[PDB]
Amino acid sequence: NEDMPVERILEAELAVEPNDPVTNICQAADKQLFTLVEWAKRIPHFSELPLDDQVILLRAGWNELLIASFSHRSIAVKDGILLATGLHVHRNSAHSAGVGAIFDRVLTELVSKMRDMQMDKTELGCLRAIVLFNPDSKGLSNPAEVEALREKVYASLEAYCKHKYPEQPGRFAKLLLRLPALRSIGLKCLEHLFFFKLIGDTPIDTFLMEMLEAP
């Protein structure tokens, strides 16, 4: 925990603490891409990576990274999500806009599960940090370097889990097992954005548009 401190990951999370429903969510998604960069920089050793690898990781992870951030933000709300733009989006607003299936998945598979285990802001940070250091990302100059950094994050996480939650032995593994849900939701989320772009009746901002362009 001296090479990858959980305290610094938590500082990175705290540093960035924030009419068609689909349009509102997209505006927030753009706003959040800018501050995602600021968050990534404050994650230990991310900036020390070559510039080209910093780009690859963020282009591969922005979906899952952002989804995880707003899910955890929305534990306090009852049946919807808290957008960073300040607006509360209820599941009915979502369903009556045609995106009810993916929205419900976020509520069930992520928000619910985060609430029920009371996932803290440090655990969120670590999980997001794990997602960021994705060694599988195609194009990475040094994959083993990224692989090494992933290991330091989850080692520091297990140390945090066994320490601050000694009564719950399975918490660390429980945390890691929201990642296939995150990944599955991430891809279906991307599939939608491409469609919104394709049909072009939803204004998409520059940074969101840039993330949605072929490698």
Partner: peptide, 10 residues
Amino acid sequence: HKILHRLLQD
């Protein structure tokens, strides 16, 4: 990816 590079540099 213009914006990303610009945002990661500073």
